[PDB]
Structures are given as structure tokens and as C-alpha cells.
Design a protein around this ligand. Structure first.
Ligand code: LQP
Ligand code: LQP
Lengths: 263, 265
């Protein structure tokens, strides 16, 4: 696509593909999640990026800490969806990347997303606050006045997610990543976690309901040779509490919540 | 994309995406396989197939993949535009063939090509059957009459008989299950998932040092949503050759067999 007239956001139109849709012939939440990360990459490339000059000298990367997605209408197979994305500072806590999905024909908002990214060393995996010299390097590509995709004060994207208590109501055990699940850098794609979380949602809910909200908290990366267990409990529209953990020791890697509506 | 001037083939340009590339920052063979099935679906839709005829719908009949052969000379890089041209052709009452040609949008050179053999089957009973004349006439008007082969060679590798892998296998990837992302719109496992499962038993060292040049896959059975697969591999060979076997974890029922050919980077 291209940067908007002010250079402070990026837009891209995607045509939804045959293998990108589910049983309802509309894009899956993982296809939407894939399209959000693609428009985010093109926005970074269009302004010279995904690290700054300081970041590569210090072996620093932006890592996902939290992802929140709300979908009102899933684009059908053959439909064009327009996604607009931008970044914003959260001082020294990290960066936020926001998205707005629109119907290319009507112009209506059909979905929206927000993500929280934190600075981390590539080698030790130790968290880090954003330095001023780093902030100066990317502020010129962000709106100065706040531009929020989810502007509601105390909303679903900032809610504290509790840890799921054993025994879980549902579970999908023995989940492993394949080469298609890794990115260009050999790490498991952040979208795979969405898929693994939804694997423990019972098929009856998937057949009768539509996923409206998904909030995911990223605690630890699943390695190529790791095995995950996906756990789910109904906390309620249908509401679920989720937990991804290592098959062996039970080390937590993700926690989240989903909200579904009757079709 | 669109049908060509004669309406006997379809072309589409795809821009390669960030999540669609592997370690070498070029499209994976599963991304290529996904793009081939996407250009095939748009070709069917552009001539009124949204993918059976009136006779096929009335008789609960569908086209199923029996064999897929893909040969790649250059994998498109992240950001590159790849142009795929696809067409179909009759093989009398045996079935249909769908062929593909991948081209570099900048140079116009052929960077890859594929051929597939499809057979008619009843959706419910899963029993194969020959292409009837009533069906043949309904789709012949969308195929070239003179043969148009992507792999025309006198002794091409797309028609070679694949043997069954003998136990013990040299390599293996056990306990492979499909997730919802592996199913298509009809809830059946996507034919591309089998390519990935086959490659899961190729050792990582081969993937890091070699590039996949040829892959031939034979489809014997479909893996159900609640099935578990075992991927087996044995080296049969500057170039590396492998013999593959996908089978059910339990009884050892065969679902796929294939071969791969790799070349040093
Ligand atoms: O990768 C980041 C920061 O994390 C998150 F926001 F994507 N970026 C990408 C660069 C291009 C857009 C502004 C710059 C911030
Ligand atoms: O899908 C097929 C044939 O099955 C298989 F070979 F792909 N089709 C759909 C139409 C495309 C032009 C020929 C028509 C027959």
C-alpha cells in the first residue's frame, strides 16, 4: 500500500483468499492477524526499517507483550479489506501499534486491533525501557497527539487477565509447531499462539458462535522443539479464559480471553 | 487476475508477504503451493465454478487431487511480484490435469512450474470414478484442445512411479495433528498441509544448506480432523534425494507417498 498524506500512518488493501477462510466462507481470526502483521511490516519498510540505528548496535528488538483484536464483520472470500496502521509512544514503557479494518466498498469499520510492544535484548531476552535516544529516532513517524484505535477509558484491551485454575474445562494437549509456524528469523510466529489458544475452544462454539473479541498476553516464547497444552474454561454471549503452557513442567507461555456472539 | 485473451488460461500476480517466507527470506514451498491453489480457484470462479458442473452437483461428485508435482528454479523474495499462469486439460476418462507456470514479473523468466492430476470421486462414499461424457463436454470448452503441457519432456519426473518406504525409516516426525488453520472452508485438511507434514521429517541440516528443487506427492487417503500422522523419510541418493511416507500413527494406514530433490545453495 502506501503511507497517508501526512506520513504518520500506512494503508493497504488485501483481497481475501480461498485458503484464508473458514467454514463460514469469511476470513479466520488468524488470517486477520496475519494481515495485521503484514501491513505493519510494510509500514516499517516504507519509512526505513524492524529496528533503529541504536537498537541494532545494542542487540535490541521490539517484542509483542499483548494483542487485542475486536471484529464486527469478517471479510468474505473475494472481498477487499482496507487496513490502516500507525505507531505511538507509551514513554519508556514501550510502543503501541494500532489497526483499523474497513470494508473497501462501504467504507465502514469492520474491525480494529491494538498491540503493546516492549524493548528486549535479542540474546539474554531481558526486558528494557525505551531510551530517549531510541524515542527520538522513531517519534518523527508517529502522531504527536494521541490517536487511539480503542479510546474507551478502562476498556477490554487494558484489563488484567487472571491465570486459569486447574482443572481446565477444555484442553488440547501435545501441540507442536511445524516449519510453516516459524517466521523468517526461525522464531514461532505470534499468530500461531492465537491458533493454539483457539484449539481448546469446543467445536460446538465455533459452529454456532462468531469470535468477537480476543485478548492475548505474551509471557514466553515457545521454542521450535517445545510442546504446548491449550487450556480453556467458560467464565460466562460466551466468554472464555485461556492458558497456553509447556507440556512438561507446565511453564506459562500465554494467557488470554475470548468473547463470542451467537450467529 | 484475469483470463487470457483466448479464455483458455488464467493469470494472477501475487506480492510475496513477510510471513510467507522462510530463513532465506524467499517464499516457502507451502506458500507457492497455497498460491497455486488460489490462482486455480480464481480461474474456476472466472468461468462459473463456485468447483463442479451441473452434472457433478446432481451426482454428488467432486474433483480430488491424486498427484502433485512442483519444480522450482528460483523462490520469489519477500516483496517480489510473482506471476502464475494456470490452465486445465482433459486426460479422457482418467481425470483432469491442472498445470501452472510461475514467472518473475520483472524479467519475465520462468522461475517454477507445477502439474497436478485430479480424479472424479463421490463426496459421500469416497469411491473414485471415470469422467463421464456429459461432464467432459461441460468443461472441455474451457481447456485448450491441442495439448499444452507445463512438463512436456520425453522422460519427465512428474509421471514416475513412487515406491513405498521400507521400515525402518532413516528419519521421522511423530504425532503430527492438524489444527483449524490446516482445514479448508469445507472442513477437510488442506492439500498443502501434507506438503508441510512430509517436509517435517527432512532433517534441519538439509533445510539450512540445500534448496528444495523438486517435490512429487501421491495422495492415497485423506487425513481426518481427529487423525494423527507420522512423517517418515529415507535418503535414496551435489544433490540430495529423499523418499517419503505419511501414515496414520495408529494402524499405519498409508495416506501419502512422495519424493523430494534438493540442491546445494
Ligand atoms: O516496530 C516498531 C515499534 O513497535 C511497533 F510499533 F511496531 N516500529 C516500526 C517503525 C515504523 C513505524 C514506526 C516505527 C515503530
Ligand atoms: O477444476 C476444474 C478441473 O479440475 C481440476 F483439474 F482442476 N475445472 C474448473 C474449470 C477451470 C477450467 C476448466 C474447468 C474444470
Amino acid at each position: 500500500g502506501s503511507l497517508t498524506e501526512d506520513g504518520l500512518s500506512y494503508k493497504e488493501k488485501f483481497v481475501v483468499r480461498s485458503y484464508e477462510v473458514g467454514s463460514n466462507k469469511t476470513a479466520t481470526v488468524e488470517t486477520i492477524a496475519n494481515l495485521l502483521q503484514e501491513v505493519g511490516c510494510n509500514h516499517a519498510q516504507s519509512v526505513g526499517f524492524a529496528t533503529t540505528t541504536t537498537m541494532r548496535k545494542l542487540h535490541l528488538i521490539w517484542v509483542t507483550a499483548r494483542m487485542h483484536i475486536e471484529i464486527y464483520k469478517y471479510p468474505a472470500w473475494g472481498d477487499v479489506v482496507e487496513i490502516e496502521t500507525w505507531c505511538q509512544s507509551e514513554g519508556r514503557i514501550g510502543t503501541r501499534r494500532d489497526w483499523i479494518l474497513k470494508d473497501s466498498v462501504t467504507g465502514e469499520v469492520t474491525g480494529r486491533a491494538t498491540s503493546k510492544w516492549v524493548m528486549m535484548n535479542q540474546d539474554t531476552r531481558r526486558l528494557q525501557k525505551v531510551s530517549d535516544d531510541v524515542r527520538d529516532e522513531y517519534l518523527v513517524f508517529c502522531p504527536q497527539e494521541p490517536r487511539l484505535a480503542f479510546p474507551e477509558e478502562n476498556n477490554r484491551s487494558l484489563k488484567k487477565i487472571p491465570k486459569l485454575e486447574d482443572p481446565a474445562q477444555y484442553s488440547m494437549i501435545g501441540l507442536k509447531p511445524r516449519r510453516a509456524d516459524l517466521d523468517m528469523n526461525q522464531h514461532v510466529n505470534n499468530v500461531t499462539y492465537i491458533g493454539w489458544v483457539l484449539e481448546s475452544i469446543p467445536q460446538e462454539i465455533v459452529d454456532t458462535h462468531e469470535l468477537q473479541v480476543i485478548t492475548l498476553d505474551y509471557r514466553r516464547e515457545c521454542q521450535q522443539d517445545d510442546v504446548v497444552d491449550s487450556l480453556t474454561t467458560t467464565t460466562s454471549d460466551s466468554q472464555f479464559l485461556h492458558l497456553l503452557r509447556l507440556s512438561g513442567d507446565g511453564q506459562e507461555i500465554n494467557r488470554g480471553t475470548t468473547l463470542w456472539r451467537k450467529k
